[PDB]
């Protein structure tokens, strides 16, 4: 594609939550670190343990930003400009195909914790986000 400037793409995801005050030196290539902060967030109940459909969101992707919105009321959960996105990582937990966005903060950073419906979906999200990273200059 290259309709990232003039149009938007929507994908199926689950929104687990947003982790804040995470060390800015976090390596998005590191499974152990990301899972460290995620597991810690789960023990503190800042993230849900298992995925229901109450966590069903639409991810709208464009050259301007990444937008997440609930499926119920479609109220906007968060809006992250592409230049505020440091990276996107696919972490495969057992049943959860986690897609984690390392983003800037509104030097610490934020981890947007998402869950794709499958492996190919997560890899697709990472590819699309890569293309978006590239079309913006």
């Amino acid at each position: 594609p290259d309709r990232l400037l003039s149009d938007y793409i929507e994908k199926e995801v689950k929104y687990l939550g947003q982790l804040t005050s995470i060390p800015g030196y976090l390596n998005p290539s590191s499974r152990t670190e990301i899972l460290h902060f995620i597991d810690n967030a789960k023990r503190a109940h800042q993230l849900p343990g298992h995925l229901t459909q109450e966590h069903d969101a639409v991810l709208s992707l464009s050259a301007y930003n990444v937008k997440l919105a609930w499926r119920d009321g479609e109220d906007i959960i968060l809006r992250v400009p592409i230049h505020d996105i440091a990276a996107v990582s696919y972490v495969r937990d057992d049943a959860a195909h986690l897609v984690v966005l390392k983003t800037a903060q509104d030097e610490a950073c934020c981890l947007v914790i998402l869950a794709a419906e499958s492996k190919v979906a997560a890899e697709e999200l990472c590819c699309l986000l890569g293309q978006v990273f590239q079309v913006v200059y």
Partner: peptide
Amino acid sequence: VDKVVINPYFG
């Protein structure tokens, strides 16, 4: 990690 894509223009 299974897959990682870096934004080379971050910041």
